[PDB]
Every structure is written in C-alpha cells, then in structure tokens.
Design a protein around this ligand. Structure first.
Ligand SMILES: CC1=C(O)/C(=C\N=C(/Cc2ccccc2)C(=O)O)C(COP(=O)(O)O)=CN1
Ligand SMILES: CC1=C(O)/C(=C\N=C(/Cc2ccccc2)C(=O)O)C(COP(=O)(O)O)=CN1
Ligand SMILES: Cc1ncc(COP(=O)(O)O)c(/C=N/[C@@H](Cc2ccccc2)C(=O)O)c1O
Ligand SMILES: Cc1ncc(COP(=O)(O)O)c(/C=N/[C@@H](Cc2ccccc2)C(=O)O)c1O
Ligand SMILES: [K+]
Ligand SMILES: [K+]
Ligand SMILES: [K+]
Ligand SMILES: [K+]
Lengths: 451, 455, 451, 455
C-alpha cells in the first residue's frame, strides 16, 4: 500500500511558516513566478528533485572523511570502485553534475552532421547535442505524449521508429541512441528491460552506440521489479546492473538517484574514448581524479548510490509520490498518468480549461498553489518551451517534484488538500500577462501579473 | 487536528528492518526483554523520549562551534543567557543530565529528617531525596491515580493535602515542594498555571521553597495554552516564563524538552545556594562553566531550548502522540487516559486479561509488539516495580502498562500507523499472547537485565 | 629530536588576538585570576589538557554516526569492545568523565574506616575517597616532591612505604592501592613497569586490591618505551595492555588520553563489583549502556583511544611538551624536572624568590603571563591548596598544560619567548592581595589586586 | 618575522607515515610520477594549493546550514552579498571552480579573431581564450622572465607593451586585458596597485575592458600592504576593494584564497553581460542561484572569503611560504626568486646540473623528494610542457622547476622543516640523483599519467 519511511529522522531543517496573507505578498514580489521565490519563504519546496535530497548519517560520516587531495584521493577510488561494481562500466569520470557529463559525451561522440535519437529529450542534454552539430530525433512511442493514457513503461523506445531512422538515414549518420531512464519529460515514466534489450539488439547489428541518461535509473529499476514479469525475484542492484549491460556508457546526475546535493559522472567501456574524456574533463570540470567535486562529495555520492539499491528505500520513494498522485486522482484532480517515479504532474490544460494557452495556465496554477499552501512547483508548459512565435507543446503541466527522504505523507497531504481545495474553485484562477522576457531561457527570469 | 511536521528532514538515520522471523530470533536472544535488544535490530525505538531526540540544522551548526575551554566557554555564556532569558532564574549550573542536577539540589536543600512533597514522584528524583535523609509525601490530587479518568490537568497538587502537611508537620520540617511538569508517573499529565500560583501562594506564606522538575515543562506549557482558559493569546515562551516565576529553582533534563541527546542544568534565585552549588558541582559534574558537558553540547542545548518555544513545533509534538493514542482508542485498544504529552500507555492488564500479573503481561505484550512490528517499547508494570527488600515478593502495582515513548522530531505519522496497526492486529487476537516466566533475574533493577521464556 | 606533527590540520579554530593593552584590561576585569578569564579573550589556553583536545576526522565521522538509543547502542558496544581489547579488563561502565568513575569506585571499594594509599593524589579522586570514610596515605617515593630533581619515573611507589603500611595498619584495613599513571601532581611523572609489577606482587600476597588512575596512561606508556630497558621493541598498545594486567580495575578520564572533549569509564574484572557498579551508575550517571554520555561521544572516545596507541602521535605529544620545557630550561627559567607528559610546571618559588608565599607568587606569575602573551595558565601553589590557616605546599608552581593536537611548536615559542622575557625582568612581578574568598574550593572564584 | 599560526587546530587529518623503504615501493608502483601516488601514501602533499585548504569552525558551521534549494537559496544571497561588499562588483554568478567561470567569460567577451593580453597566462585560462578564437599576447614586463631576479611586483604589466598593442592592433580588435593576481606562472609574483591603476587609465581611454584572474588576489593584497608605499595604513579588505575598482569583472577560483575545497564565481558590472551570463551558466554549471555548487559550499565560500581578509591570517600564510624559501636559500638550495605568495619553486636545472633536460631532472627530483621525506611536489618543467603537435619533440622550457605548493592552514613550520631538511640533505649529495626515461607516455597531458624508470 503506502509503507512508512524505511528510516528515522536524524536531523531536521527549520522552515518558515508564514500565513497566507504573507505568502501572497511574497508571490507578488516574485512577479508571480515560482522560480523567483526565496527559499526562506517556502514551506514545501517541490520545484525539483535535483540536489535537494536529504543525506543519511553514513553519508555525513563520509563528509567528515573528505580526502581533498588534487590527485589520488581515496574518495575517488571509493566512487570509482562503487560505480564499476554497481553499474558494470569499465571507466568512470566524475563531473560536478549531470550536464557536465553531457558536455563531455556530446563532444566525444557527435560528428557535426550525425543524428541523435532518444526516448524524448531533456533541455540540457539536447542543448549539448545540438551545440555539437547534432539533430535530435524523438523515437519514443506515441503513447508517451498522451498525459492521460495510463499504460506501463511509457518511456519505451518505438523499435519501428528506430528501424525507420536506420533505414532512411543510415547507421553511419547516427551518432548514438540516447536512452533516458526514467523519461523526465513524459512524467517520469520507466523503460522496460525488454525494451533496453531490444534496442541493444537492433543497434549492435548496425554498429550504433547506445548511451544512457541514467539520472533516475534506480527509480526505473523499481518499476521493472514491480511491473515487468520475471524480475520479482531480482534485487534492485541486479536490475541496475542488467540495465547498463545493454549500454556502451552513461551520463549520471548524482543529484537525483545518488541521494546527494551535488555531483555526477560519465561512464563508458571504450578505452580510447576514456582517454579523450580525461583530456577534455581537465578544461571544463577538473582533474579526472575529482572532476570538479570536493573529495567529500565523491564520498557522499559513492555511499548514496549504494544506499539507493535498498529495496525498502526505493519502494517508499516511488510509493510516496504515488500516494500524492492517488489522493489527487481520487478527488478528481487531472494529473499525468501513470504517476512517475519522482514527481506528480498536474494537467493544467484540464485544470484550467477556462483559460487559453496564451494566458499561461500552468504558470498561473503554480503561482496560486504557492499562495494557498506555501508549496513551490515548477511550470512545465509553454513558458518552459520558450521566427517570433510562442511554441505550443501538448503538455501544459505543473510539476510537483519530490526530493528524496525530505518530506512525509503529512506533507503530501498538505499539498494534496490545498490543490484539491483550489481545484474545487478552479474558476477563480486568473490569467497572466508578460512583464519582461529574455530569450533562450525565459522560464527562470520572466515576471507576470494577473489579468 | 493532527498538523503536518513543521519542518523538513535534513538527514536520515539508517535502519535495518529485519523481517518478522528474524525479529523473533532477536527477541529470543534478548530473553524476551526489550531492554536487551540491540539498537541496530530495532525499526522504531519507543523505549524513551530521553536523549533520543533529533536536532535541527542550527543545532548541528552550533555543534561545529564548540568552545571546549575548561572555564569561560562562550557556549556556557550562551546557555546561561538563554535560560535566564526564557526561564527567568537568576543563576544556572550545567549538569550532564537531569539526575546530576537532582543530586546537587537534594544535597543543597534537604536537611536530614525533613519532608519533600510533590505531585507524585520520579525514580531518580525520589532516590536522591531519600538518599539525603528526606521523607517523600505525595500531595497530588486523588484524580491522578485513576488511569481511566479523562480529565484535564491531572498533575495538579491538592492544595488541602499540602495544607494538611504544613499543619500536621511543621513548616520548618519541610525541605521543599517538588512540583513536576509534566508528571511522568501519571502518564505525562500537565499541571495548570492556577495550581502553580496557588502552590506559590501557600508556600510563600510559610517560607517554604518550591523547586520544579521541569524536564517536560514545554509540553506542560502547551497544555496550558490549549486547555486552560485565559492563556490562548499567550505564546509558549510567555507561559514558560510565568510557570517558573512561581518557583525558587528547577532541575532540568535537557535530554527531554531541550531537543538534545545529552545535557541538563540546575536553576535557582538564591545567591547563597548558588555559591554552594558551584562548590558541589566540581566534585560530581565538573566546573560551573561546563558541568560535565562538552562545550558543543551546551551550545546545542541553548539552541534547542529556544527552538522548543516555537508553537508549531510543540503543537505537532503533542498532537503526534495524541494521534497514536486516538487511533488506538478508536479501535478499542485500552490505554491510559488522557494521553500525555510524551507517551501512550497501553493498559496491559486489560490488553492481556487472560494472563495474571505473575505471568508478566506487560513484559509479554512488549515482546510481541517488537516481533510483529519491530517497535521497541518499555515495560512499566510488575517487572519494573521490582521486589520487596525484606519479604522478597513482587511489588504489585495498580498499573500494568506498556509505555510507547515518542522521541521528538524522529518519527512521522506513518511510523505511528506502524505502531498502531500492529498493536491493533495483535489486540484482535490478543488471546494468543502467552505469559512469561523468569529464567534469569538479577538482584536489583531487574527490568534492564532479566531474561524470560514462554509458559 | 623534535618531530613534526604526525598529522595534518583538517580544520582550524578562530581565535582573538587582542593587543597587550586590551589583555591588561581583561586581566583586571578577571580580578587577576586566570580562572575567571573568558575563553574568547585568550590566544593560547594552557589552563588544562582535560577535554580541550582536537579530535581527528575519523572521530568526527563517528560523531555523525551517533546511535542515541537508551539501551543497546552500537557506540557502547564499540567502546566496550575497544577497552576490553586494549586495556584487557573484563567489564566496563561508561561515565560522563573521570570523577564520575571515581564516585562509583569509592562507594564500591571503601569501608568507612579503611586506608587508601597511592602515589600522591588528585583533588577529585581524594575527595570521593575521603567522602566515603577513607584516610589517604601517600606512598610515593620522597624524590617525587623535589621539583628540581631530574630522575626517571618519579611517580614510582616506594615499596618500603607500602610494606610499612601493610605492617603497621594490616591488610584488612587497606581498601585498595590507588596507582596513578601518570602522577599529575608531581608534574606528570611516569611510573615504571617494574614498579607496577612489584606493587602487584606485594599487594597480591596480602589480598589487597590495586586500582589505577589511568587518565594519562598512554603518556605513561611512552615513557616506558623510551626510558625503561627491554620495552624498546614493544608497541604502545602492548605496553598499555601489560600495565593494566597488574591492576584489578581502573578509573579513566577520556578527556585526557582518549583524545575527546568529554567522557570517561570505569573498568574492573570482578563480576560481583560490576553488578554493584551497574546498580550505582543508574542514580548518578545513567544507564550502564551510555552512562551519562551521548552515543556519539562513546564512539568518539572508542576511536580516540585507538588513535592514542599510535607511536608517532604519542611521541610528538610528549616531545612537544618537552620542547617547551627545554627552551625554558635553556634560558634559565626554573621548571619542574623532568618535564612531564602533559604539562610544563614553572617553579614560581624560584621564579619569584623576591616575593613571599603569602603574596601568591604563582597566582601573580600566572596573571602576568597572560597580560604579556595572552597565554592562560593554572596556578598550582598555595591557593589551590586552600583551624584558620593558609596551608603551605612544597610546590609553588604555574602549570602550562598542553591540550593534545591543538597547538604547534610556533605556539610553544610564543609561550617560551614571553615567559623568558618576563623572567629577564622578574623583579617587576608584584604581589597579590585577596578580594573575596569562598571555602572548600577557592582557586576558581577568588579575586586579587596588585600590592 | 615568521609569526605563529593565528589560530588553533580544531580537528586533525590522519596520515599513514610509511617508512622510507615503503615509500620507495609506492614511488616505483607510481612509475616515479608523483601524480600517480595515492593520497593515503603521502605525509605532506604539496602538489597544489587548489582546493586543499583547511576550513575554519565557522565554515563548518555554515556547512551544517546548507540551503539546498534549486533557486533562491539563502547561501547564494550570502555569497552574493559578501562578494559585492568585499569586491565591489555589481553582479555575481557562482561556478563550480575557476575554469568554469573562465569558460563563461571567454564565450561572453571574445569575438572570434580578437586579441587577449595579460601579464603572462595560465593553462586553463589561455585555453578557453584560444578555444573561443582569441590570440594571446603577453604584455608582462621583461623582468618577470628572469627566475633569479629578486625584485618586487614582477607581475606588473609593461604599459609600453600594452600601448604598442593598442597602436599596432586596433583597440576594436582587443577583447580585454586579463590581469592575473597573482601571476602563477612567474612563481606567484604580485601586481602593484599603481600598475592596476595605470592599466585602468590606459584601457578606459580606448574603451577596452579589463577582467581580473583573482584566484590569489588576497595574497596579492598582502604584498601591496607589505611592500608598496602608501598602503601600510590600509587593511587587507580596503586594498582588495581598491584592486577590483580598476576592473570591469573577474573570474575567481574559490579553491585558492576563499579557503574552501571547491567553488568559484564570475563577477562583472555590465548589466547586459550579466544577462547573457545567467543564460550561459545554465547549460554548463547550473542555475544562477547555485551554479554547480551545493548550497553549503556557497556558504563556506562566503565565510572563507571574509576570513581571508584578516591581516594576521594572510601575513602568516605568506610568511610560512617565505620561511620555507628562506631556509632553502640560506642552505644554498637554488630556488626561484623572489618567493611567491603560495609556493616555492626549486630550480631543478641547477639542482641537477649533472643531468640533461632529456633526463627529466625535475621529475626525478620530485620522486626523490617523496622517497626521502614523504612530501609530494609537482613537476613544473619539460614533462609538464608536453610535446609539439606537428614535429613531436619536447617543448623545452627555460624553467625546469619543482613546485612546492602550500595549502592554506594545513601545515605548520615543523612540516616546512621536514620539507627543507630533506631537500637540503638531498642537495648535499645531489650527484646521486639519477635520471629518468619514459616507459609509458600518453598522447596528451603527460604529467598526470606517464610512467618512468631510472637510467
Ligand atoms: C533526465 C535528466 C534530467 O532530469 C536532468 C536534470 N533535471 C533537472 C534539473 C534541471 C535542469 C535544467 C532546467 C531545470 C531543471 C530537473 O529539475 O528535473 C539532467 C541534468 O543534470 P544536472 O541538473 O545534474 O546537470 C539530465 N538528464
Ligand atoms: C590524574 C587525574 C586527573 O588529572 C583528573 C583531572 N585533571 C584535571 C581536571 C581538573 C579537576 C579538578 C580541578 C581542576 C582540574 C586537570 O586539569 O589536570 C581526574 C578527574 O577527571 P575529570 O576531570 O575527567 O572528571 C582524575 N585523575
Ligand atoms: C520527570 C523526570 N525527571 C527527571 C529525570 C532524570 O533525568 P535524566 O537523568 O534522565 O536526564 C527523568 C528521566 N526520564 C527518562 C529516562 C529514564 C530514567 C530512569 C529509568 C529509565 C529511563 C524516562 O522517563 O524514561 C524524568 O522523566
Ligand atoms: C591563476 C589561476 N587561474 C585559474 C585557475 C583555474 O581555476 P580552478 O578551475 O582550478 O578552480 C588556476 C588553477 N590552479 C591550480 C590547479 C591546477 C590547474 C591546472 C593544472 C594543474 C593544477 C595550480 O595552480 O596548481 C590558477 O592557478
Ligand atoms: K543542491
Ligand atoms: K542519547
Ligand atoms: K570540553
Ligand atoms: K578539493
């Protein structure tokens, strides 16, 4: 059902609990953009699950044993040994976070004319691919773009779409396949092991490389153990190890499923690409022996990755998010289904049907959510999407992203009860109008006002 | 109505979570005594709320700023300034925990042969009083001894009983009145402000001193704000300050409402007694500048005491315990009422009516609770009562209970549901619970080391 | 010679560096009593080596793994296993510090008429002995009371004095022998292994118990390895284990050679006395599973005791103190000889020969030391000693007590150079006059003024 | 004259301290390359002063108060307020370390084909400049290239060389002047305030921007207070603020003079460039609210930067390095002069005159230094210079040196004596030092992974 936290609270973080009238003032000062809210003014911060996790006592013990040597740090040897043991890859290069590893991989495996195809995309990953002269091709199955379609493993790659790309464009013009686990843009949807095995079968026949975006791979591994038949007797670690056996490398953001506040790494099996990675990491991140991370942070990441393999931890992590989604779904609140491993996405298109998409319903829904409850959420609709056009995506959603081991079921009830009350008078949600807008990346800095 | 935690989780503590068949092995290795269980084998440890609290990020920041000087530590000045500000007492002496401060007070304010009267007693406090030649007299009102009587402020002192003591026994023969907030032995029951004022009024008329046992004074202050009329507009800090304005001093166990894992102190307003307190703390605890505590621990206690004054914290603290008690009461599980500020007491006599008290139902109920849920609780019945010194029979108490003591800021409502659901399932087939028989029994304090086996 | 610190600095403590004119004001506000100085106003705090030590990264890692359970804490099992391994005793009871263990032992092994004899005494130890109705008898050899006599192992017990006590008073009237390692009052002087072996031989023949005051036992073990023939091939741990094989138990203040800021314990081999110790620790310290200590503090003490067995640590610890004494002795400054393991004692009797003992030379020397350098020292002459008399001891000294791993050789040079300059114009040191004096323990609270 | 540490040791780091015969084994396993040594096998690690510093108790207290929010973290506001207060710049963007900020600045202020001129260069800074289509021009005064010339402020820019560049190359074709304080490649040599003012005067007349490489700016500020007339009455903070008043921005590696183990930031006054900086930091470092750093690390850097402004700290920092250099110079050991703010450079060409540069004397000297003392140092000569891209021969530099880089607040004078005494003993029989020959050599960056064997 909904198991209790498989841990005790070792230490707590003090938070401000300003009343509604105070929160309304803070939201007005922030231009009705949740990205501009001060952390000190937020009760429950569901903006992202990236780097906001709570570490364990064992991780903080490693923090006291930081070997800050520039080369040969014991923390690096611990992290290297851990990733090689759990992921199975031959070579590891630490980076300060995920997009640092993406910067490395995109410069190492992309020729300025090749194609990169994957199960949807992420902002930072696609930028570095296109920065290095690649053209992105989405080969996820079409069901992944249907927010309400409740089917299992929506992140699976359409093998027919991949076969079409290899035929129409040729394998020589395909840089690599970028398989993401889980698929963040589809709502945190998992990829099945049979899909990873089938993708590896087709790519290996044409000499195409496969690189994983593994930031939420542990959450993906739980869905395999829970819903894919034949993996019920397999541990999380066994599933994680089998997942990466169908890849030539991976980029990892430790800030997610490694249960840390900073850190990432790049993995690969090819010796020659590892040599070029060590030469390139020096100018962007640092030495291959620390890669832009303090020694204590490599230690915390090595310990956190091993803690993520505990079944009871990852079961509670996913089922806490599912509890929030189930409570909203039972009250009639429209959400993306099925609930992903790391967040619940409110479908602002259905939530705010009385508002047009030019009126920023997701942004206005996120602003109202904070004022009524003190809960911060991230707009993931047209504004995040960015001639002189608006650019309209199918998904006008508000993301309630759950940090790991930070909040309780009672905190989820505060989020649910407030959204449910807000939904009961959803007609009151007003539209927004732009005040100041940069280019490139406007979701972070734009300001709005009620219409 | 059961608020969410007024804080986030900064860091977590790893637990093993062994399955039921493994927990049965651990319980058998522990002789069916929860006191002999290893901490590493316990999912939810409700043995005590003493020193088991979770500290805040600000407290751990103070832990990094420990001034470990033997004298004149800045951490002591911060603790001294904090207690003088919040409690109002003139002089402070730190101790390593509560019973260290009780050892000092009992030697400073008791002449051999005098009487000490209080709203019931505690084990360590009464020992140091009687060790120094005092005779304890219970002056709590009779309603406190009714486990099922659900009334407010059961810890209040019966003013007539105190008046009777002053009349039958000379006031010169009364060492002091020991007012405890809350009253742990009655189930964590609070004392009203009107009672503390009346006690201060009566004792001041006869020159009698009043010293508070304030280990859970903050929980007591919340009950005043919630249930005593006239205090709804007053903050927790204002209530705490008014409480101690009716006392000449106090002994504090910081391990409770100061939100720390170690620490205590002794307070008083009398200059002459403070001089003797500084001379006596040297031989038992340490210098008056640290009193058996590391500097970082005085800092954490100074910060934690100020954090306890937050209304939202203490409201959630009390209502989390109340949530556990209400869920048990709604399922028909017999508990001591009303629910105290820090624990829920299962009535093991009614829970295990098919067992006699010679069969240790509370001890057997605690063992089954761990096996079914991984929750450790404390037996508070015949085993804890011990044996009589001369006749060598069982000290048979009216209360055969199992104490579910909640550490502060450590567990969630979901953890309380684990405790409730397991006890409720165990209660639905309570007839299966077997009795226990001694297989090893020490000479004194038997709850800690005794071993048992099923009958 | 004088080896470098066998460790690196992991973290530093910020200290105030007020000028001389500021320090003079602070000293006047403190009534010229170094005990009343604020820690924030002191550059180098040499008041005591008790609880002022710097812990290691491994100890602070254990601090993050505090098992704060009331019973069955893993930290207790670590501490118990460590002491049983290194000391060899069968039973251990943790206490909040040394005088807590002394309170326990004195109530368990003293009948209100028996004698307690030891190599000199300490204030807290002798109080609890006399509190429980014992009469103290000093059986240290007479050479220990000669501050200038530079001989080895001045802390040895005079076997003839012990034989005289057993004959004149009988073994039935002797509670136990209290052997202290090292002897703090004699200047931190060590006890030889042959002495501990000979004492055990004589006491066992008469059924007398031997209990060690082992607060500085590791420093004692180094002197055995350095100066007693036959122990040069033996490690510190082997020497420590052999030392306690000649004792029935011990009281330990972890605040000394366990490299912690709080903590102690009581050891013994007798099962029946251990049962009574567990009953008595409950009313004074706490449960036998934590004994008035947080779980993290038991962990830090278990780790610190194992770190103390490293030869390079304890060699540098002793030789840093010796460096201070050698630099003062080479300049003509009168000190207690030989230099002990934990402190250097300035002989204020020779330092201030132009002042009488009624003028508190040690107290006035300590006050002047702070004003000129910002160094705090402890007066250990007549004032510490306390009819209506003054009570005159042979030793009018000023103790420069060195915390472990806290200061460097450069800090010792600041102490030495300032004392040497002060000694060159020692005639300027003025006498003191009492302003306010309590009874029982007057060194802590008394105030003075210049004459 | 060599002051004592202006602080106490709060906590220590455990070291192994293996004997000489064991260290020889470790050095052979590392192919006689100090870069391949394990940190656990090193007594004194003088490889770099970057990110190896010891933090204070106040910094570790801030580490416990990490606000790990993705946006609007209080730690960012503290860092932003601190840099704006101490440096005077209008806008701040955090980065994970210095070369992250250099990556941003090079893409923001360089159009392809422009010139970048500075007082010598650094490896990472020059790479990002040339990666973005710039041509580097050295405008340091000629005295900086004389290793033995003991003069003050060798890092000053030759104003005539800058005037010549503006004349021969149009000012529109000059991206910016990159003024580094201190100059690491010249041995950590400082830049005078009069030079920074003259550079600002000349560049402002032609509309040219000036950006500082300020990683060791605090050490530079001490040299101004110590050796430049007119600044003896000014505090370190006042000097730092005046230095940056002659710049339009800066790139900072907090891993140096901010007393942290990770962190950096990018500063500027131009509003338009700051808008582009926030857009570019997202794809490389992270949000402008954390920029690739944990919240606790921004807090530690904010606290450490304020601690670096203490005169007594930075005086001891510089004079501890000077103590090592003076002890070597007094024994006849050849070093680069004057001693820089952060390291001492051994002249391995003179130290090992019996060896040719093809025999890697600096690499062989570093290996012997570790075997005799357990001290790791960095080879800074022919091996670090690498090979030419086309012809494939050795890049032969004038400086064949061994760098003894001192982390801040990590070691004592006794540790410096260990370094000096071992090098002095090694110098007394320097003829025994053998040459090295390649047994494994990578394709690029060979100092890190290459292996050697004795000839
Ligand atoms: C699937 C996947 C991710 O979700 C991911 C980061 N997610 C993020 C962080 C983010 C990044 C950009 C704008 C807003 C928020 C999330 O808020 O969801 C990265 C980058 O890793 P990094 O942030 O550690 O560099 C790679 N792949
Ligand atoms: C040999 C020996 C000791 O030296 C010792 C403490 N020394 C102390 C501490 C102290 C105690 C009383 C007055 C002043 C200073 C020292 O400053 O030198 C204790 C008590 O242990 P505790 O302080 O941990 O209770 C037992 N034996
Ligand atoms: C009202 C009151 N006053 C003083 C003290 C002593 O303070 P301290 O010395 O413990 O800090 C306590 C201790 N309460 C704990 C711990 C305990 C104590 C004895 C036996 C078992 C467990 C419990 O109630 O379980 C107390 O409740
Ligand atoms: C003046 C100056 N400006 C910028 C940076 C980059 O900053 P960051 O990215 O390192 O934080 C540095 C790095 N200095 C270190 C570390 C190092 C760097 C390259 C090779 C080996 C070692 C050293 O000098 O040894 C620097 O000195
Ligand atoms: K973070
Ligand atoms: K505790
Ligand atoms: K201390
Ligand atoms: K580092």
């Amino acid at each position: 059902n909904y198991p209790a936290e498989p841990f005790r609270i070792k230490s707590v973080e003090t938070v401000s609990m300003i009343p509604r009238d105070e929160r309304l003032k803070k939201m007005q000062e922030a231009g009705y953009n949740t990205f501009l809210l001060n952390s000190k003014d937020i009760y429950i911060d569901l903006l992202t699950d990236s780097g906001t996790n709570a570490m364990s006592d064992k991780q903080w013990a490693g923090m006291m044993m930081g070997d800050e040597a520039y080369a040969g740090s014991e923390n690096f040897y611990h992290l290297e040994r851990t990733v090689q043991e759990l992921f199975g890859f031959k070579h590891i290069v630490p980076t300060h976070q995920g997009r640092g590893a993406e910067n490395l991989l995109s410069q190492l495996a992309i020729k300025p004319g090749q194609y990169v195809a994957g199960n949807m995309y992420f902002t930072t990953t696609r930028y570095h691919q296109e920065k290095n002269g690649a053209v992105f091709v989405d080969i996820v199955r079409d069901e992944a773009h249907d927010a309400g379609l409740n089917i299992a493993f929506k992140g699976d790659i359409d093998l027919k779409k991949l076969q079409k790309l290899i035929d129409e464009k040729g394998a020589e013009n395909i840089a690599y396949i970028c398989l993401a686990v889980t698929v963040n843009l589809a709502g945190g949807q998992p990829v099945s092991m049979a899909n990873m095995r089938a993708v590896r079968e087709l790519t290996a026949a044409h000499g195409i490389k496969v690189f994983y975006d593994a930031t939420r791979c542990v959450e993906n591994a739980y869905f395999i153990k829970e819903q894919e038949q034949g993996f019920e007797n397999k541990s999380i670690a066994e599933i994680v190890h089998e997942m990466f056996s169908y890849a030539d490398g991976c980029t990892m953001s430790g800030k997610k499923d490694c249960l840390v506040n900073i850190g990432g790494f790049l993995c690969m099996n090819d010796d020659e690409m590892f040599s070029s990675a060590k030469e390139l990491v020096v100018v962007y991140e640092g030495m291959p022996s620390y890669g832009g991370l303090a020694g204590r942070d490599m230690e915390a990441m090595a310990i956190g990755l091993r803690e993520a393999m505990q079944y009871e931890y990852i079961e509670h992590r996913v089922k806490q998010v599912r509890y929030l989604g189930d409570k909203l779904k039972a009250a009639g609140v429209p959400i993306v289904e099925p609930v992903g491993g790391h967040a619940v996405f409110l479908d602002a298109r259905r939530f705010c049907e009385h508002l047009t998409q030019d009126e920023f319903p997701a942004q206005s829904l996120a602003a109202s959510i904070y004022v009524e409850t003190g809960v911060r959420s991230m707009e993931r609709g047209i504004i995040s999407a960015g001639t002189g056009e608006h650019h309209r995506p199918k998904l006008e959603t508000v993301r309630l992203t759950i940090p790991r081991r930070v909040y309780t079921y009672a905190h989820m009830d505060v989020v649910a009860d407030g959204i449910i009350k807000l939904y009961q008078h959803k007609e009151d949600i007003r539209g927004l109008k732009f005040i100041y807008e940069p280019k490139q990346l406007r979701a972070f800095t734009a300001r709005f006002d009620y219409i």
